[PDB]
């Protein structure tokens, strides 16, 4: 009976996979819309508020390669609220 | 042999029962032959993206579409 | 303590004999602070106090060794006018000898603390003047 | 760096000031260690967990077992002086001063 | 002990060494630690007295800490390099920990409070198991690290090292702390060479292993652990006085013997580098490792002194001890320098 | 170092799918059959150039194929879809065998009006290839130079000039 | 305050361990060393180290530190100024450690130190239907093979060494 | 979240019914009670054998904490060297307790 | 010591844990894998003696991915010239970072 019902369980499963894989393109799109749209709010506030501070570069990277990095939480969610804050970087984690 | 084994069985059955099981679990993967089928269903497992080839002109076994001929089936597992 | 070693030698010799003579009554004080340390850490004094008194003891011993051993070799270079000379730390590691054994309250101690100081720091302005490495840096 | 690494690293060496200074018992040398240990283990995780570098995960309970053994032949060695001198204080253990 | 639980403890042993030698992972070089400590631990305590329950404890405790250290070195080392290749260090404090643990773990001062207790608190051939094949691993961990090891803080615990080693077995009269003195003194001339040329280093680490051996294999062939008790073999086996004496004239380092070779070989490699102050006030301590050597061979092969009556019925029987490798080990520890350049082997 | 280059917010505008997980999950296998294309030029893009920013208007045209798959849906077949991906929404793990017969339904309904097929176990998890006219990422890390390597050995090996030279000894 | 919790934990941890290396008594040091293995844990715990926490949980306390306090019990028969000093004294220094990373945000003890919550530096995507850290430790079977042989044969020496060790002959 | 709500009502809960244990009778004021076990006075008698049935507990579990991801270790594609090396666990596992039968670790708490 | 027994023999004991580039079960990334591949592909070979200064530029790159120290220093000089500014009371935030603007997808 566990031969049976596990062998159906693995076909289940491949099927969850496979709906999940046909769905990560839609996903990973808007995920990179997303993501480039936090960073280009955090750079025009970053903009208009670091006018006065001497020297200062908006936007300069970091890294001296020019390749795109990943951003970090405090990249995406530094001048956001907490409760954001909390609901991305610890709600899975705590989510019961 | 024989009178060692119901010498043992009189005495300890527990440890007759617990060195057949035990031998069983070593000896028997290599006998069956469903353990092909163990692998085969782990890897035809996707937890990951299928990443894409492009296309230079020569893959004749590579598809273009999910829904082609070509490429791996897994009608093994749905008829088992 | 590496700085205080560099503010020692960073002042020349015959010029400001207070500072000199402060910086080598600082690392008198740092290296009676180490003896001290490991006095009470190796041997237990029988109280909080009798400890205290051992570490003011040795590192006021120390400390005073070296106050006089700046002191004769700065003075000395002053009325000598070479600064550039070990014989000026020669009389100020002798100083310090019969300091270390004034501080023992002994003559023999005191002399033998006067031969060998004395020889240890013209060694050691001999080796600031050609350039004698202790701590070697790798070459080959 | 990380605010949280600054605080796992102050308590490896706030055990390792404890077991750097004896009071009486063995046992609480042997916690010490053991503390060390426990921190040693959290900051491997929280640096395996951050980097994503998914093969080290394995890595903090070898880190746990080997020391976990370890501790259980400490326990051994004290359970042995505790045979010899009925309790487990350090100072019984002077014998090799001559 | 079982002699099948006594040779799977050995492997064990040696294992654990094997691990730290050939791994490049630092997970598996703590590990090796663990199971060279794990496995040696019963070696100490072989014979179940209160002297080697002290003693184990003692190396336990000591270890334990190098062991953590180590771990923590090893630690911060993926916090600034996110790897975990056995090379060099990429932080300071991770080398000055890792070079801590090390120096612990091979007893060098000021860590060498541990040294002669456990050896004094143990038998001779776990005694010679300690001060020989312990030193392998550690110094394996140092080979491969020179270029993050800083110099100040080697040369320090070198000098150190040196300095209380010889300090140390001048008011000594039992064997083990005698060979625990010099083992610490021997540790001190091994890593002031090291950041200079590692193969000076491992030269004097294997005639280091050498010596020592002799001496612990002539002292297991005699049953002596005192000076006084070596002091009856020119009664009992008057071989065994000039072999003692060749040894320890050779461990003083003294020509034309062998132990000349290392010091001699670390001077020729510390003033390339342009120390010449380091190697001379390293040559004049070596002096006090040489008079306490002396102060033996005084009591052993140049002088007799008295026996007892007992003696007499000891001459009626030979020596049934395997003596394994004693003339190999005599041999290769005095006559040896005519084959100095042979070092290039360890190149 | 240098300035990070973001796309403005008007390169990141796009008309988006504002449905539930629970629709998407239950369109999941005619959504991998009809919008094979688009999806997997965009993918293959994005393990290529290893930047977001190279990959927006595929991107975009990942976004244009879905919506143009569910309104495709919306016209047609907007019965048996909603009784279907509600059943799949209920679950809390939403299993797709709880809810075989509005499965079948919907499959049923779209054959007929749309001659879609449903892929089978095996067919959405194939490596597929994908013709781009967009050119291969030459430098996809933008890795620098690297350091030239020290000199190999070569030469046969001759005998050492009078032995070791150590001090005295000839050999 | 909610967004600096794993922070905090780390605090009342570094609390737990001048909980016993003060040493009060090797009973009470085991009751301090089970409160910091539980806030270590969920330190852990609040990172996704779900098994590894579990492994705090049920190796090192319910595994380890009850042998910790089943041999303590064996000793120290059943009925300080030094203990006090020492515990304020840490206490005293690890919140002056706080005051000042939190007014400034930044310190130096040995490194620099940020002074923000620790939540920043997370990563911002998912690992599908998996845990990374759960398929690393399955790894274990698969490619730590040497590691595994390895910590067997350190648990077997282990075995054999105890029952060496203490039997005493 | 949720979690740590939960801990901290069975916590709270818990230390308020000791609470009330400790205090309800408290409130009596019954009598002051003077009242001036099987050992007399000895001290605790160190038993050999209960330290080694708990650190034989502690290798064990160690070895347990080495067995524990095997569910997720059979989703793997190196089947074989996973079969293997999971038997070789279990197996060092059984040997550890033959040693400590046949050399007569398990004696009086069998 | 170190008798390199694994290459002599061909066998891999410990190298697969070493690096985080290495291969990982079902493929997962390290949060620095393309750094670490940039400073081992320019390091690789030519001894750590020229590594550490002909290679410096992709071991700080892959430092500063690792810890984020610059990052964060910069979070911390933006976000403590922004609360600056709001007790001056001359930069208000946009409705984007307070909450009320039904994020994107
Ligand atoms: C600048 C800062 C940095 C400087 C360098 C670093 C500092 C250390 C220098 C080198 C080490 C010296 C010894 C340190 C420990 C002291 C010994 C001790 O414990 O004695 C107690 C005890 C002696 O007591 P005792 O046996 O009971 O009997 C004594 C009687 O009862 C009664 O005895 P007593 O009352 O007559 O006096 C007892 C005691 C009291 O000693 C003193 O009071 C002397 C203190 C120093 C006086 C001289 C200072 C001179 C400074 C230089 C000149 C100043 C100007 C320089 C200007 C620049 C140059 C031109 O005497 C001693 O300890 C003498 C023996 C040791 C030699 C000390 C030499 C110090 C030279 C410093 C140079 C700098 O000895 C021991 O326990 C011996 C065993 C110790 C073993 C462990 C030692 C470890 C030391 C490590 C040091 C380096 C650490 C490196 C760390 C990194 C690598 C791991
Ligand atoms: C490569 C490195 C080699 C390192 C040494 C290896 C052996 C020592 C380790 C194991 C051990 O203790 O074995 C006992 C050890 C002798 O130590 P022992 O107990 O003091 O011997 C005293 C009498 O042999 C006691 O007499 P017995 O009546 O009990 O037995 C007589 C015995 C009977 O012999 C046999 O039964 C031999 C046949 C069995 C061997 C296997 C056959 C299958 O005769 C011998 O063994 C004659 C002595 C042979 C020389 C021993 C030392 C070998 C050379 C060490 C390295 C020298 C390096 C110089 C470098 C200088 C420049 C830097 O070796 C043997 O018994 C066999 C030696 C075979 C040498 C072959 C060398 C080339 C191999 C390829
Ligand atoms: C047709 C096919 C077949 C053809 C066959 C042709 C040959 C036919 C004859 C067969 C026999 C040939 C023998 C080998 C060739 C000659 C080697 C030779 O004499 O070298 C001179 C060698 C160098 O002098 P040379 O005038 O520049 O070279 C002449 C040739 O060109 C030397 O030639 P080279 O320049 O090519 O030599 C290379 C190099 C040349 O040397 C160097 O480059 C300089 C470094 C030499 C070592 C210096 C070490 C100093 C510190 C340690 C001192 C130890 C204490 C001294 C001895 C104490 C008592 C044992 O040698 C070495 O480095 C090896 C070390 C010395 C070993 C010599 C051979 C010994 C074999 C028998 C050993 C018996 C015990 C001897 C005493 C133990 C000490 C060796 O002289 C010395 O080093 C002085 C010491 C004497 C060495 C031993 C002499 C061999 C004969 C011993 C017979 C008496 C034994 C009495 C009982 C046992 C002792 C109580
Ligand atoms: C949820 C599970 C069940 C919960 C517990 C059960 C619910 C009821 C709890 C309260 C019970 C009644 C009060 C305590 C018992 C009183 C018995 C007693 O000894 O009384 C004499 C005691 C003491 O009176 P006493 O002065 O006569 O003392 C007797 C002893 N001599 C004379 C020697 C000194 O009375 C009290 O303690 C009165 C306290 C207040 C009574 C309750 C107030 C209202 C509470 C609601
Ligand atoms: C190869 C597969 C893997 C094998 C290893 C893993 C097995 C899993 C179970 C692990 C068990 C661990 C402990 C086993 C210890 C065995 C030795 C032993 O107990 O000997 C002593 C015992 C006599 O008992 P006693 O000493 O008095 O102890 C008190 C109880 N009366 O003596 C006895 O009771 C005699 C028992 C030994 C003979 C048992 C024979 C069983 C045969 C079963 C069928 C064939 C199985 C083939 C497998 C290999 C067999 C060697
Ligand atoms: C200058 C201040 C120096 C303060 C430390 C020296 C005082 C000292 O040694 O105190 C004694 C103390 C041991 O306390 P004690 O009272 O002897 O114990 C018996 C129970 N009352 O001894 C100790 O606790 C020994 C360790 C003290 C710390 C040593 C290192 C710092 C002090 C020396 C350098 C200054
Ligand atoms: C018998 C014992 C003999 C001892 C002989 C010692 C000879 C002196 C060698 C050290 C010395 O004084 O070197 C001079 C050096 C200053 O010159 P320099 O090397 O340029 O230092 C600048 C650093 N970049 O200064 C240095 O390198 C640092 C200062 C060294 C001072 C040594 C003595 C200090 C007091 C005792 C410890
Ligand atoms: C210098 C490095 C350490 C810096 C922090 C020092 C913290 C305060 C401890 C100072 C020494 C106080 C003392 O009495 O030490 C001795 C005591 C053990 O001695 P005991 O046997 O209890 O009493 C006899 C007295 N010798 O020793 C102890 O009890 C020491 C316990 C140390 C635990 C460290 C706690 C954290 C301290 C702050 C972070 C470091
Ligand atoms: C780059 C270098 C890399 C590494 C290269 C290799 C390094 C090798 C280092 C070897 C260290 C050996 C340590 C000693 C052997 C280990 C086992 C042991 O201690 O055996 C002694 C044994 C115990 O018997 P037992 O009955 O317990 O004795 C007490 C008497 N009642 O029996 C006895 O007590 C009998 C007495 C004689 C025992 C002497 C054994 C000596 C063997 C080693 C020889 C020296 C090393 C080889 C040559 C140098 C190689 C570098």
Same mark, same amino acid.
């Given at each position: ?48 508020? !670091? ?46 | ?61 590579? #598809? ?17 | ?20 003579? *402060? ?21 237990? #004094? ?70 060998? !100081? ?23 | ?98 | ?12 042993? !040696?294992?654990?060494?094997? /691990? ?101 608190? /143990? ?116 071989? !065994? ?76 029987? #030979? ?29 | ?28 296998? &005619? ?6 294309? #688009? ?133 | ?16 361990? $001048? ?19 539980? $806030? ?59 005051? *000042? $990373? ?7 003890? $040995? ?37 595994? /042989? ?20 | ?110 | ?94 409705? &984007? ?9």
């Amino acid at each position: 009976s566990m031969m049976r019902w596990n062998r159906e369980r693995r076909r289940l499963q491949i099927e969850d996979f496979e709906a999940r894989i046909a769905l990560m393109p839609l996903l990973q799109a808007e995920k990179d819309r997303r993501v480039l749209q936090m960073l280009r709010e955090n750079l025009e506030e970053e903009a208009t508020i !670091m006018k006065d501070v001497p020297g200062w570069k908006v936007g300069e990277s970091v890294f001296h390669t020019t390749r795109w990095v990943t951003p970090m939480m405090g990249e995406l969610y530094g001048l956001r609220t907490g409760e954001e804050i909390l609901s991305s970087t610890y709600g899975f984690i705590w989510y019961t | 042999v024989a009178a060692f084994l119901k010498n043992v069985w009189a005495k300890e059955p527990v440890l007759v029962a617990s060195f057949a099981i035990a031998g069983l679990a070593v000896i028997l993967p290599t006998l069956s032959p469903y353990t092909k089928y163990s692998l085969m269903i782990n890897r035809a497992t996707p937890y990951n993206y299928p990443v894409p080839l492009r296309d230079d002109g020569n893959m004749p076994d590579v #598809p273009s579409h999910p829904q082609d001929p070509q490429g791996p089936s897994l009608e093994w597992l749905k008829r088992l | 303590a590496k700085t205080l070693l560099h503010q020692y030698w960073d002042i020349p010799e015959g010029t400001e004999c207070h500072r000199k003579t *402060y910086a080598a009554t600082s690392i008198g004080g740092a290296s009676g602070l180490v003896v001290s340390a490991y006095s009470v850490a190796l041997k237990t #004094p029988t109280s909080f106090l009798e400890g205290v008194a051992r570490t003011g003891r040795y590192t006021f011993t120390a400390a005073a060794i070296g106050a006089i051993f700046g002191l004769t070799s700065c003075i000395s270079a002053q009325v000598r006018e070479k600064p550039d000379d070990p014989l000026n730390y020669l009389i100020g590691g002798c100083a310090g000898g019969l300091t270390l054994g004034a501080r023992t309250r002994s003559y023999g101690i005191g002399a033998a603390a006067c031969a060998y !100081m004395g020889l240890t720091a013209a060694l050691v302005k001999m080796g600031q003047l050609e350039g004698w490495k202790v701590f070697a840096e790798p070459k080959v | 760096m990380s605010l949280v690494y600054m605080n796992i690293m102050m308590a490896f060496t706030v055990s390792l000031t404890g077991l750097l200074m004896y009071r009486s018992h063995l046992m609480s040398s042997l916690l010490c260690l053991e503390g060390m240990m426990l921190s040693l283990f959290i900051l491997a995780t929280l640096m395996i967990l951050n980097s994503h570098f998914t093969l080290a995960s394995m890595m903090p309970i070898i880190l746990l077992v080997f020391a976990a053994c370890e501790a259980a032949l400490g326990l051994s060695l004290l359970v042995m002086v505790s045979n010899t001198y009925g309790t487990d204080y350090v100072q019984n253990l002077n014998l090799l001063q001559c | 002990m079982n002699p099948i639980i006594l040779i799977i403890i050995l492997m064990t042993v !040696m294992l654990g060494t094997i /691990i730290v030698m050939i791994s490049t992972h630092w997970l598996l070089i703590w590990i090796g630690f663990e199971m060279n400590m794990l496995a040696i631990i019963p070696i100490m305590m072989k014979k179940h007295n209160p002297r080697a329950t002290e003693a184990s404890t003692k190396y336990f405790l000591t270890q334990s800490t190098a062991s953590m250290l180590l771990m923590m070195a090893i630690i911060i080392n993926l916090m600034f390099s996110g790897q975990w290749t056995v090379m060099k260090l990429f932080n300071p404090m991770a080398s000055m920990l890792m070079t801590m643990a090390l120096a612990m773990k091979l007893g060098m001062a000021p860590f060498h409070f541990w040294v002669p207790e456990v050896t004094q608190g /143990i038998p001779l051939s776990s005694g010679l198991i300690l001060l020989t094949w312990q030193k392998l691993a550690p110094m394996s961990v140092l080979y491969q690290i020179l270029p993050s090891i800083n110099l100040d803080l080697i040369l320090t615990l070198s000098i150190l090292s040196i300095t209380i080693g010889g300090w140390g077995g001048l008011n000594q009269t039992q064997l083990r702390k005698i060979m625990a003195y010099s083992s610490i003194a021997h540790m001190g001339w091994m890593t002031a060479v090291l950041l200079y040329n590692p193969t000076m280093t491992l030269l004097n680490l294997i005639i280091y292993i050498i010596m020592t051996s002799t001496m612990f294999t002539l002292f297991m062939a005699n049953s002596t652990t005192t000076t006084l008790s070596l002091s009856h073999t020119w009664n009992k086996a008057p071989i !065994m006085t000039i072999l003692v004496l060749i040894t320890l004239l050779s461990m003083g380092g003294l020509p034309p013997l062998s132990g000349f070779m290392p010091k001699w070989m670390i001077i020729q490699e510390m003033t390339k580098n342009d120390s010449i102050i380091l190697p001379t006030l390293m040559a004049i301590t070596a002096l006090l490792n040489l008079y306490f050597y002396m102060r033996l061979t005084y009591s052993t092969a140049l002088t007799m002194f008295p026996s007892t009556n007992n003696m007499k019925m000891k001459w009626q029987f #030979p020596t049934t001890k395997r003596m394994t490798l004693l003339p190999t080990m005599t041999v290769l520890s005095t006559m040896l320098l005519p084959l100095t350049p042979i070092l290039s082997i360890l190149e | 170092p240098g300035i990070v280059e973001l796309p403005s917010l008007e390169d990141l505008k796009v008309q988006e799918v504002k449905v539930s997980s629970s629709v998407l999950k239950a369109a999941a296998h &005619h959504y991998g059959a009809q919008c094979d294309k #688009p999806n997997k030029e965009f993918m293959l893009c994005r393990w290529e150039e290893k930047d977001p920013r190279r990959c927006l208007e595929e991107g975009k045209l990942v976004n244009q194929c879905a919506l143009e798959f569910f309104r495709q849906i919306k016209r047609h077949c907007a019965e048996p879809f909603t009784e279907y991906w509600t059943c799949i929404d209920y679950s809390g793990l939403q299993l797709f065998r709880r809810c075989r017969k509005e499965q079948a339904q919907f499959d049923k309904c779209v054959l007929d009006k749309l001659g879609w097929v449903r892929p089978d176990l095996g067919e959405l998890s194939k490596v597929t290839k994908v013709k781009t006219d967009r050119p291969l990422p030459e430098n996809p890390y933008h890795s620098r130079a690297r350091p030239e390597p020290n000199p190999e050995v070569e030469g046969d090996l001759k005998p050492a000039r009078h032995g070791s030279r150590l001090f005295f000894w000839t050999m | 305050m909610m967004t600096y919790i794993v922070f905090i934990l780390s605090i009342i941890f570094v609390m737990g361990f $001048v909980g016993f290396s003060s040493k009060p008594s090797p009973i009470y040091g085991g009751l301090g060393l089970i409160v910091s293995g539980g $806030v270590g844990c969920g330190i852990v715990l609040n990172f996704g180290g779900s098994f590894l926490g579990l492994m705090v949980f049920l190796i090192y306390l319910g595994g380890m530190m009850v042998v910790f306090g089943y041999t303590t019990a064996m000793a120290t028969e059943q009925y300080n100024k030094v203990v006090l000093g020492t515990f304020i004294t840490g206490l005293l220094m690890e919140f002056l450690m706080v005051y *000042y $990373v939190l007014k400034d945000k930044e310190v130096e003890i $040995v490194f620099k130190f940020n002074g923000m919550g620790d939540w920043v530096i997370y990563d911002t995507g998912d690992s599908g239907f998996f845990s990374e850290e759960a398929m690393g430790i399955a790894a274990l079977y698969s490619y730590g093979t040497w590691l595994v /042989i390895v910590t067997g044969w350190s648990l077997l020496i282990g075995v054999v060494v105890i029952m060496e060790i203490t039997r005493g002959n | 979240m949720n979690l740590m709500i939960t801990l901290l009502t069975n916590f709270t809960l818990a230390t308020l019914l000791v609470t009330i244990a400790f205090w309800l009778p408290q409130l009596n004021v019954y009598s002051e009670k003077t009242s001036p076990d099987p050992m007399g006075s000895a001290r605790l008698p160190f038993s050999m054998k209960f330290f080694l049935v708990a650190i034989t507990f502690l290798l064990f579990d160690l070895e347990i904490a080495l067995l524990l991801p095997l569910p997720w270790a059979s989703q793997t594609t190196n089947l074989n060297t996973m079969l293997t090396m999971a038997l070789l666990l279990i197996f060092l596992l059984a040997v550890s307790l033959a040693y400590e039968w046949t050399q007569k670790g398990l004696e009086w708490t069998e | 010591p170190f008798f390199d027994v694994q290459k002599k023999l061909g066998v891999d004991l410990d190298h697969w844990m070493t690096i985080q580039s290495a291969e990982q079960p079902h493929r997962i990334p390290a949060r620095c894998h393309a750094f670490e591949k940039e400073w081992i592909e320019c390091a690789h070979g030519i001894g750590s003696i020229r590594a550490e200064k002909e290679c410096k530029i992709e071991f700080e790159d892959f430092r500063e991915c690792l810890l984020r120290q610059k990052t964060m220093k910069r979070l911390n000089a933006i976000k403590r010239q922004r609360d600056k500014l709001i007790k001056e009371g001359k930069y208000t935030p946009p409705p &984007h970072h307070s909450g009320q603007e039904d994020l994107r997808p």
